[PDB]
Design a protein around this ligand. Structure first.
Ligand SMILES: [Zn+2]
Ligand SMILES: [Zn+2]
Ligand SMILES: [Zn+2]
Ligand SMILES: [Zn+2]
Ligand SMILES: [Zn+2]
Ligand SMILES: [Zn+2]
Lengths: 460, 460, 462
């Protein structure tokens, strides 16, 4: 029943938080409810973090979050127990100017792919709109932001051409000229003088501006800018004749992000920082799907920043960060590939995971993963101590591998990093699948990590 | 308000009746409800239909239905007002033997495409299972039928391969080896001696047998055969930022079938068969998507059978069927193509329809449609009288045309036949779209047809 | 022993009746012997069929036959029990003008393929000639018909080119210029045409040697020959084969295998049927031209079956018969051979959906309209088999494969009756010499016999 319940919570989480902004906001609220104190990056933390340590979190760009627990008795030699995952997922972004003239009466919006989207899997899917709106209340100068979400209303859909037309209906399709979202077909109010005051007037259809303004509860004239996504509004579902699966969009990598954060929360419940000598954290990054080379991506170093700022404010004595990282363990948690029975030729025998068993170690000898022999032994020892099962995933020698933030974090910190994650089918599809038990199994494993990684690594 | 309500009824209709069997059963129930008397094809109608005529309907194969209204004062010269549509839709059929050995633990079922399915649009879609089961209660010899439907449970899904793997993940995909539905991943009850009594034991996984037996409320041993489909369980939805669209699966051709049937029922409410001099009917065919050459398809002649049997039982005097058909008008109602703004190059200027305007006339000079100059004039006159709008659809000279049952019905009866229908986007996709007002506009047009076609045709 | 005997009877049947004309003539003769009364299509049957019903058969074009048994107590609601098969088989037809000048002394005849013949399987095969001759006895105007058959003499052979010549000897070969039957190599001393022979409307259209030969076979004068429809076919007699005699090798199995099995079943069944007591209407209708689409008057689309049932029911009783009710209560078995699993091409056969030799009838299933078989029909055949102690196999194509067709969909659409496509499976369909199980002819007869005996009782359960 526990696994079923957490599976449902995950489904609701995915459904109610479609964009990276919503996901980060969701975790921030969860953290607040569990007494983690928010610290602003733009302020020095010397007086915010005392010698008793505590539970805190910070956010960068509204899409990069780091939650951490610092014990009163922590010292550099104890290192840091880290779980890094990414909260961005393949999606479709409205262009800076999404406005398009009507085509034979059809209303459409100009968009661009974020990652490998706008392909055949994105055709004929109900797409909602949502994201971040920047506005300036009339009469003021302060710029504020609001999050909007059309769910359950699918405002647009990219229409496939009927096969009846022949060759023109065969893919692949041009992402600029053919995979364009259709948003409506209006029939014969004109822009008001006040609406025309918006810096966005003309850059987006007045109907769209009025719609998002209404969702945010502000005036069109107050809209300053926006960063909106188009996403599948179909709610996730437990599937399979025996209910062995969970079908849902954007699993990569909110599946691991969710599991890691919930594990951190469950773990934190029994941790009193006044009697703890550990430093634990779950850091969630944006932009992994586009290379991670952005200030809000893994290469932006929020993790390193949090550890340095915290250790500096924490004690009056200098902290040797090189010693800290040398004694740390970073779990780069990113979903990997579940065996797909219909494509046996691309999976390496003895090196593929199956549903509802446990976390999957990502192994690669050519640098695609940071996992090493010691890290592998550590995870397997951990699992043995906690009653967890560990699976493997490595590509066939004649295949190719995707990447993760693992190597970046390992190189940037110098800390042993282990790439692993909850395996899923159809990675990067608009609607993927994993085991109905995998969310709970993932939480269990990550919870065990925070509880016992230090004692286990001591044996090495 | 009426348009919004009928649009919602249509959505519910599609969702609650996934297979052709369900659709026919739905209409039969609706007809019983509106006082149409069911007549079995296996019995002579001489003592079921008399001088007073009345409202009746019959069914063939459980997938071919004909509803008709015969007035006491009808005569051969009055002809027959007909609307013919098809109730079969592209789907996926379980094979005679759907059993497949588990593959690395994964449960899969052997299926075959009905029409052009099992393509990329069918990948990563939540698929439910349903259809007709034939069973024989223990200790008896009688064979009975039962309809089952897993909705909302999606028992399977055809998993796309992650793009990370390269070329192997690029379509098109083999319909036999790559697009196979995954139904589960079982963990370690063995078949019982009684379950093995089923003629289907071994032909389908015992898990699937137990599941459909449970849905039908019968024992596994009692199952002797089945005709099941796999279909999208995502309920339809009104979409577009201005709610101008309706997104739903299996629109072709249940959209016209529903509109025509509802129009008949609305029309019948005010028809007094004791006074009426008309003979009206809506006949729904199976197998249009596979050529119509089956006994339950248009070429099977149920329409002609209904008219001959009815006219024979109706009066003691001989009825000249050639005169009947010479004075008849057949509307071959099959969905046609809405202009898709992203593929302007395949639509003929001045010969394409748009959403929420009205019925679309299907025109073709090379025999793909039966529509002629007189039929076109008749529909346009009919529309002018009822306050309906009429659109056009014809292919570009350098394009390709789909087909309909139109030419078959016209040739088989000798009656002037007009091909038309409610236009839709993405015909044959697993999830298509049409205007949110189009179901209502369609009903309005067809209602007008039954009411005024005789008076209009008289002018010619 | 019974299976072995019937297997031999089948082999003899195939060997002694090479063309569609011979096959129909063979069955007509068998029906006559078993007291089935012949009825001409050209005369009204009102006075030929009485209320006592009876056993009859009719023929159209000499290549389309329908045999039926009508019970005195039959009524529309009882429907009709039908087995439909085709008697035409892939062959080679002499052209309207088969004459060809000698080539370096070689005599050849101009021919055309009927279906997919004249390929590599037809090369280096001993070919006999036979078929229908139309003639008019000297001094008269009446046109008569005669059937001829050169068997065992193979008058023709299409010679493969020795591989020594290289590329030119590699197929495929042009059906008009390369696959031409060689009929002889004459020498001076074949006499010149006599004045009487030149009187034949066929003189000049076919070499005099051929005209004299077929005239001799028929027992008429060359001058009396007016027209002809002749085939070239393999004269190699069928044989029981396999180290354990598990197989039967023979030409033209598609679809004379099912046609023979169905007719024998009908005759065996008819032996115990007394029309004075019976309330059934049973028939085996054999069609021509299935191999070319069936759209001819003698093919399935020509409607001989529908005609027989309408004409019979009309002559049978004074009361009106509702044909729609008749067909709604009927079951049609479209019996056409399907594919036996070929172990050397496992990649084209669908797992769990292919038949093997010597087991039983094979149900032909297809979800895209190639077969008329449906869920109720499948259940009916399986129930029917369980009752008669017959085994039922399955055949359906892989999703990425291709399917052939049958007359099934045509018969179902034309009548409106539930139709089931099935048949005796064979290897190498459309080859000049195919193969099936040595027990399959017998198993087929057994199944079809069971169909006529119990289909009505079984269909009642639905
Ligand atoms: Zn990814
Ligand atoms: Zn990822
Ligand atoms: Zn269609
Ligand atoms: Zn259609
Ligand atoms: Zn054939
Ligand atoms: Zn055949």
């Amino acid at each position: 029943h526990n696994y079923e319940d957490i599976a449902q919570e995950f489904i609701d989480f995915i459904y109610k938080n479609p964009t990276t902004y919503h996901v980060v906001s969701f975790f921030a609220e969860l953290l607040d409810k569990h007494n983690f104190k928010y610290l602003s990056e733009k302020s020095n933390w010397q007086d915010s973090i005392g010698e008793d340590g505590g539970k805190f979190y910070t956010i960068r760009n509204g899409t990069n979050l780091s939650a951490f627990i610092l014990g009163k008795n922590w010292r550099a030699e104890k290192g840091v127990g880290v779980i890094g995952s990414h909260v961005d997922a393949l999606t479709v972004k409205l262009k800076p100017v999404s406005f398009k003239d009507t085509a034979e009466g059809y209303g459409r919006i100009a968009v661009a792919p974020y990652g490998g989207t706008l392909n055949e899997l994105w055709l004929d899917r109900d797409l909602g709109i949502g994201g971040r709106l920047l506005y300036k209340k009339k009469g003021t100068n302060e710029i504020k932001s609001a999050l909007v979400d059309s769910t359950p209303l699918p405002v647009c859909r990219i229409p496939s051409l009927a096969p009846h037309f022949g060759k023109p209906a065969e893919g692949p399709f041009d992402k600029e000229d053919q995979t364009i979202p259709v948003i409506g077909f209006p029939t014969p109010e004109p822009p008001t003088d006040d609406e025309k005051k918006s810096p966005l007037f003309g850059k987006h259809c007045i109907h769209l501006l009025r719609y998002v303004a209404k969702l945010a509860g502000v005036e069109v004239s107050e809209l300053i800018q926006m960063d909106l996504d188009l996403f599948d509004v179909q709610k996730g579902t437990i599937g399979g004749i025996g209910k062995h699966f969970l079908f849902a969009p954007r699993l990569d990598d909110r599946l691991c992000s969710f599991a890691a954060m919930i594990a951190l929360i469950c773990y934190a419940k029994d941790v009193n920082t006044e009697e703890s000598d550990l430093f634990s954290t779950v850091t969630l990054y944006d932009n992994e799907e586009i290379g991670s080379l952005t200030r809000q991506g893994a290469k932006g170093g929020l993790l390193e920043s949090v550890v340095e700022r915290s250790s500096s404010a924490f004690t009056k004595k200098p902290v040797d960060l090189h010693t800290v990282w040398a004694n740390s363990i970073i779990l780069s948690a990113d979903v990997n590939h579940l065996y797909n029975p219909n494509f046996p030729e691309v999976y390496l025998k003895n090196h593929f995971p199956v549903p509802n068993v446990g976390i999957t170690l990502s192994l690669d000898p050519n640098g695609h993963m940071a996992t090493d022999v010691v890290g592998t032994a550590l995870v397997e020892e951990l699992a043995r101590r906690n009653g967890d099962k560990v699976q493997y995933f490595q590509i066939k020698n004649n295949s190719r591998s995707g990447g993760t933030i693992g190597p970046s974090l390992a190189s940037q910190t110098g800390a042993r990093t282990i790439d692993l994650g909850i395996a899923q089918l159809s990675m990067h599809s608009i609607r993927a699948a994993t085991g109905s038990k995998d969310v709970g199994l993932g939480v269990k494993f990550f919870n065990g990590f925070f509880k016992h990684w230090r004692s286990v690594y001591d044996e090495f």
